[PDB]
Structure formats: C-alpha cells, structure tokens
Design a protein around this nucleic acid. Structure first.
Length: 806
RNA sequence: AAAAAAAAUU
C-alpha cells in the first residue's frame, strides 16, 4: 500500500487530450478459476493452448457444456459459470477447481479505496480479453505479433521488423481501462543457418573460398546464433528442432564425438563422416563449423547446412546502430499518424464481437478516452557573467546566445590527444576546431586560454595508458584532455577506464567528424559538458520559483540499475545512485556498485546513500532535512519487495549516520517504459513536425490510479515520432507534498540537466543515474573476480567528487 | 564518443 492521492493539481493551462485507454465495463459477477496441469510441463504456451482447445472442443458433453472458457496458456483457466466438476481432479491433462474470483469486488475496490486492487480479479479480466488474440497471433510479453504480410523491413544481420500491438488491462480512476498501442519489434528471419551466417559476417559468396572461418568470424557468428532455435532438414520432413548452445571451433570435417553402438560401446566419429554413413549426405561445407545443441555434454553437433532458423523468434539480443536506425525509419510515426493507427486498430479488432469477451459479458468503448490535462509553466533559468541573463524556456527549449555560465571555469592548462590518424585530422584542421572552440568557450564564460600544453597523435587502445600516465606525471595540474576519436572505437572505454578510474583526469571526447566540420551548436554543447566536468555551474533555477522544500537543506537522489545483455549471465548488474551537492540544485556526485546479475533491488543502497549524505555534508556543511528519491521504473510485480527493501535501506542510512537524524523521505518511481500515449484533442494545439503535446503537459485524473498518488508528466518537447509521457508513482511521502508542489518540482528538475539547454524527459538526477550506470559498463570492458569487478567500477579519488559522467 | 527526442540424437 502506497500513500493516497492528496488532491489534484490546479496549476497551468488546461488542455484537452485523448489517451490510448479504452473504457471497460465489467459485470459485477463471480468467475470460476480452474487449474490445468499438463504433462510434460516444460512445453511452450502455444502448445498448451492447442491442448486446451482440443480438450474444449472434444469433451463438450462430458465436462464443458457449451461454455467458452478462457486460458492463459499455462496453468490458469476461467469460466463464467461453474463446470459440472465440483471439486475433482478430472483426467495427459488434469483440471481441478481452484477459487472464485469476484469482479464485484474489483468494481468496489475502484470506487472505495479501502482495499488494494485485487490482482487475481484483474488477472482474470486480462486473460479473458486477450484470449482470442493469443490464438490468432504470436504473443510476446504483453504484446501480439504476426508474420509480415503486405510489408517487409529487413534490419540486416538476419533480423527483420514484425508489426503488432501492445494490449493490457489496468485499473484507472473510476473504471478498468484497456490500453492499446501499435508496436513493432525485431524477429529473426526464417532462413537457412548458412544465409543467417552470411548476413552476420557480410559474406557475399559463400562458395568463393571454401576455407574454415577465422576466429573473429566464428566468435562474431557465435554470439549471434547462441540461444536461437534451429530445425533440421536432413530427416524426411520430420524437422526436429533444437536450441543452439554453441558453435564448434573445429570444422565439421575435424569435429569428433563418441558414436554409440547398438552394443553400447563407443567409437570416435567425425561429424562429416557420420552424416555420410548415416544419411548418405556428403556435406557441401565440411570446412564450416557445427552447431552444438542440447546439453553441453551430450556432444550433439549439427553441420550448418542441415539447419534453418526456426520461424517466429523475437530478437532479445540488442540491435546495432544501423539496425536501430533502420527500425526507427520503418516504425516511427508522428503523433497524429500513430493516433490514427491506434483508432483504426481499435475499430478493426471489434472487441465487442469477440465471442469470449461476450461470454463474460464484457463491453469496451470504441473511442480513446478524453482527458483534461494542464500545461505547467516552465521555470526560468539564471545565467552568470556581468549581465546575469535569464533564460526563459519556450516549448521545452532555450539557448546560450548572449549568456555566460553561472559559474564559468577558466581553462589555462589543457591537452589534445588525437587518436584519429594525422592525415584525417591535420594540425591546421585541429587548430581550426581549437580556434572555434575557444571563441565559443570565451563567449560562455569558460575561456580556454592560449595553446594546449600538449598535443600528440597516437593509435590504438594500448597507447592510452602510457600517454595519460606521462600527462599526469608531467602536468599534475592538467585541467582537461580533449581526446579526438575515429568513430566508434575500443579506445573510448580505455580513455574512460584510464581517466575516470586509474589516474583521475578529466577527459572530453569528440568524434573526428565533429572536429573536421565544426558547427557552433556542437561546440557550444561541448562547453556545457566541459564546464561541469571541471566543477563549474552552467545555470541555476531562478531561486524564488522553487518549492518550500528549499527553506531547509534538501538532497535529491536518482537511482537506476542496468542488467547485462541477454545471453550474458556472467556479467554483473550495475547499480547507480547520484545525489545533489548544493542548494540550487545543480551539481551532483555519483556512487556506483556491481551486484548479482538480474537482481533489481539495489543491494548496497544503504551504504550508497550514506556516502552521498556524508559528501553532501562535506560540501555544504548541512545535513539535509529531506530526501527526495527518484527511482527508475521496475517490474510492477516486484516493486512491493523493491520498496520494502529500498525504503528501509534509505532509512537505515540515516539511522546509521547519527542518533536522532530522521529526515523526511519521498520515494518516487519514474517510468518511461509503458504504452500510454497522449494526443492533443484540438488539432491546433499540436506542436512541431511530429505534432506532439506541449512540453509540460500533466495528467493526474481519469487515466491514473483510482486512489494512490500518481501522475503523467510529459516534460519534454517531442522532436520525432510520438512522445512518451513519463509516469510518476509516489510510493512513500513523509513530506506531505501537495499535487502541485510535487508536479512542479518534478518538472523543474527536468530543466536542470547539464548536457543541453532543453527540458528532458525525466528529472536530471534519474537521468544522471543512467549515465553513471552506463559509464561503469565501459569501465568493466577488459578487452579474485567479485572483488576485481567492484574495483574496476571504483573511480579515482580525484574525479570521484566531480561530474565525470556528464 | 556535442546533444535531445525517437522503435525495443550426435
């Protein structure tokens, strides 16, 4: 149980909106919940649905009547009236009654408040409404897809775009709502394994050179196919499927396995020879490796040429850079375009004609729910210099033109390390970028004075550490190294490992293409990062517009955790907590840890908060009387456990610091990872080419929680596609914020982000936490272990208190 | 890595 919504907000200008939420009308009835268990039970959900379907259609007069039950594909089945089964395990499948779920109770929860929304009742409603979809389409998380028909969008690397939709049912202010959004995700093309391989290795003619793969080629191919299912072609249309657990180092020609004889003895056989003796198949590519499938001890190896990628597998592995861009061009669409697609999808699903939805007397509205939101007023920013200019945000954006940093750092001692080849970045071009940067930096109050003390060309990652060591040895007062990089490169991680964690030196990296073509905007943005890295302040919130929380010392924290990529289970999850270090709030310090893979709870949270509080005290000489904690979204089903642990840890950090130190805690989870979309009802209110809602629009009624304290705030200007409004859930509040105070404060924090003169989509602290976690992933790049991983992530004392993550 | 937004048996 979270705190109750204290009231609704009154600040700002009302704006009429439409939300991809569709009203659901449920009957006030009892539904009946049965358990099904099937043997074997390691089987995919699509199989179980087949079994249950076969069962329903066949055993009508015996044990089903003419009812239309609904099934989740696993263990749960629901019916609108009781089955003539009583209380009996009927029989490879059995059914036995479990419980009654009350939709009457769910209705009352929504208009009363006094009990938590009953999740078993919501679950039964969801299963019922997605039952037909689950048979017609391929289910993926809470979404549905079908194979490309009438379109084709390959991504490269054996991947392609499938279009589909997200569907979920959620309790809202007075009613259950159906949330529908259009969606698109990457799937693997169903094609032979050899063609998959050629795509991922960029081989244009596999018959050109019949020689084994290089080690790099095999490694690259391996990371790509590991975990996928494949099916075999050499058996008479049997087409047995397997999962890939590895790719052999040896060609099929050289790969051996113990061949078991009828007697039970074993002889050594090669894969190539086996396929000849057994299937009378002489391999075309005995130089290519095999797929190891099944257990890593059952020695089962498949030559590539007898294998196809199984149709219909989603790509969980991360997309590359092109891949991602390619996908966005095919999938993104303006707010109005998306708005039409949702509505068309909605009109074309005909939910009220779904005979399952009818069986349960459920009704859904055809039209997007209308909602009134409010556009919050944007805070003004205070700049420095002799004019002390103000910036007034306009549609979520302002600029540095005519403005000096609130506190600008003078830069007299700085170096250039150019890791791009000299021919691609010659001294004259380098001097040109340098001259430009200096003019711009001087205009911003952060003058880079004179010539660099050191400017040298190098190549490769291995050269970073010796050069940086020399630099630290020779210029112990070096303020900055500008590192020039040739595109994406392993030296970046090396520069950050060496500068952030080994030696404690500030570095600002810049792509050579940006050095070669100096745009004013780009150089100006570089100054923003450089100034704070060197301990400057770019701007502050004009102080009089702040929350009453600033009457006393207050600290703002942001927290995030990043998990290792799919496949990786070895690599750790990373936890990051940042905290404000002044009263503006502008400057932040960071803490970071490594922990058990996949754990969402921030395990060292108490330790981490304690460090931040101690550092806050060192810097301001006050103890905060309040702690405002912004937590990145977690999985809904785990957040009671998350909250219980983390709220206690934060409390513990205070308690373990000093007797009688009890600051008030506000704990807010921020979620961008959801499918709620908001559109202007009035065409004329749409902003930009993308036609999105204005930066600052806030919604805290109608589509939000029926009794708890949550709101949507779209803090940023929509540049492309359809904006995602961030969702804020208040899980704890000792500080008794009113709605306005907390919505305004959250919005203001989106204007304190140092890396751009724009309101960003989440508060600065939460955003910095993400950056910090991402930087630590670079520190771990390696090119006893648990103690070694913790050390790799610990940054040097000389940068530990700086904003190295900007 | 100037930056924000943006789609996710063998």
């Amino acid at each position: 149980q979270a705190p109750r919504r204290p009231g609704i907000g009154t600040v700002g200008k009302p704006i009429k909106l439409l939300a991809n939420y569709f009203e659901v009308d449920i009957p006030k009835i009892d539904v009946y919940h049965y358990e099904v268990d099937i043997k074997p039970d390691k089987c995919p959900r699509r199989v179980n649905r087949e079994v249950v379907e076969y069962m329903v259609q066949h055993f009508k007069p015996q044990i089903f009547g003419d009812r239309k039950p609904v099934y989740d594909g696993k263990k749960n089945i629901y019916t609108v009236t009781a089955l003539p089964i009583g209380n009996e395990r009927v029989d490879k499948v059995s059914i036995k009654w479990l419980a009654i779920v009350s939709w009457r109770m769910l209705h009352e929860a929504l208009v009363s408040g006094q009990i938590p929304v009953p999740l078993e009742s919501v679950q039964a409603l969801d299963v019922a409404m997605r039952h037909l979809a689950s048979m017609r389409y391929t289910p993926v998380g809470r979404s549905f897809f079908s194979p490309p028909e009438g379109y084709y969008h390959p991504l490269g690397g054996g991947r392609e775009v499938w279009f589909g939709f997200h569907q979920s049912v959620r309790p809202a202010m007075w009613k259950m709502m159906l949330n529908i959004d259009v969606s698109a995700t990457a799937f693997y093309k169903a094609q032979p394994v050899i063609e998959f391989m050629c795509e991922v290795l960029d081989i244009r003619n596999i018959d050109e050179q019949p020689k084994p793969l290089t080690d790099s080629q095999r490694v690259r191919f391996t990371k790509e196919i590991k975990g996928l299912k494949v099916e075999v072609t050499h058996c008479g249309q049997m087409k047995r499927k397997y999962r890939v657990c590895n790719v052999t180092r040896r060609p099929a020609s050289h790969q051996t396995f113990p061949l078991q004889l009828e007697s039970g003895q074993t002889v050594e056989c090669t894969v190539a020879q086996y396929f000849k003796q057994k299937y009378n198949l002489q391999l075309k590519y005995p130089h290519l490796p095999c797929l190891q499938v099944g257990q890593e001890q059952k020695h089962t190896y498949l030559p590539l040429e007898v294998c196809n990628i199984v149709a219909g597998q989603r790509c969980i592995k991360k997309l590359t850079d092109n891949q991602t861009s390619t996908m966005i061009k095919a999938t993104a669409r303006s707010a109005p375009d998306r708005q039409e697609e949702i509505s068309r999808l909605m009109k074309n699903a005909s939910y009220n004609l779904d005979p399952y939805i009818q069986e349960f007397g459920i009704k859904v509205k055809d039209d997007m729910t209308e909602v009134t939101g409010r556009v919050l007023p944007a805070p003004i920013l205070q700049y420095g210099g002799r004019n002390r200019a103000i910036a007034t945000p306009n549609q979520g954006v302002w600029d540095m033109r005519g403005k000096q940093f609130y506190n600008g750092i003078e830069i007299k001692v700085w170096a250039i390390a150019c890791f791009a080849p000299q021919k691609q970045c010659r001294e004259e071009v380098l001097k040109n970028f340098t001259d430009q940067l200096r003019k711009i930096s001087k205009d911003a109050g952060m003058p880079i004075q004179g010539q660099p003390c050191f400017c040298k060309y190098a190549q490769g990652a291995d050269s970073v550490e010796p050069m940086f060591r020399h630099l630290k040895n020779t210029y112990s007062g070096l303020q900055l190294i500008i590192v020039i990089l040739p595109g994406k490169t392993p030296v970046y991680a090396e520069v950050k490992r060496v500068g952030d964690t080994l030696l404690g030196m500030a570095t600002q990296c810049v792509q050579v293409k940006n050095v070669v073509k100096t745009s004013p905007q780009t150089l100006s943005n570089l100054c923003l990062k450089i100034n704070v890295k060197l301990g400057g302040i770019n701007n502050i919130l004009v102080p009089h517009q702040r929350s009453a929380v600033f009457q006393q010392p207050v600290i703002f924290l942001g927290a995030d955790v990043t998990h290792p990529p799919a496949g990786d289970g070895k690599k750790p999850s990373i936890t990051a907590v940042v905290g404000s270090m002044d009263a503006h709030p502008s400057r932040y310090c960071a803490t970071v840890r490594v922990q058990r893979p996949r754990q969402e709870i921030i395990e060292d949270l108490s330790y981490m908060v304690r460090e931040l509080l101690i550092q806050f005290y060192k810097s301001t000489r006050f103890k905060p009387t309040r702690i405002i904690f912004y937590r990145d979204g977690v999985p809904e089903g785990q957040l009671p456990q998350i909250l219980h642990y983390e709220l206690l840890a934060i409390r513990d950090a205070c308690i373990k610091l000093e007797k009688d130190y009890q600051p008030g805690i506000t704990y807010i989870v921020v979620q961008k990872r959801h499918h709620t979309r908001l559109f202007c009802a009035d065409k004329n209110e749409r902003i930009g080419k993308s036609g999105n809602i204005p930066a600052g629009t806030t919604v805290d009624t109608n589509i939000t929680h029926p009794f708890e304290f949550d709101f949507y705030l779209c803090s940023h200007a929509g540049i492309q596609g359809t904006s995602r409004p961030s969702h804020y859930y208040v899980l704890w509040d000792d500080n008794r914020f009113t709605a306005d105070e907390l919505q305004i404060l959250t919005y203001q924090l989106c204007h304190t982000y140092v890396r751009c003169t724009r309101s960003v989509s989440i508060p600065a602290p939460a955003y910095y936490a993400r950056l910090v976690a991402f930087r630590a992933r670079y520190h771990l790049v390696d090119k006893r272990d648990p103690q070694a991983l913790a050390k790799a992530v610990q940054v040097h004392q000389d940068t530990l208190r700086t904003m190295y993550f900007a």
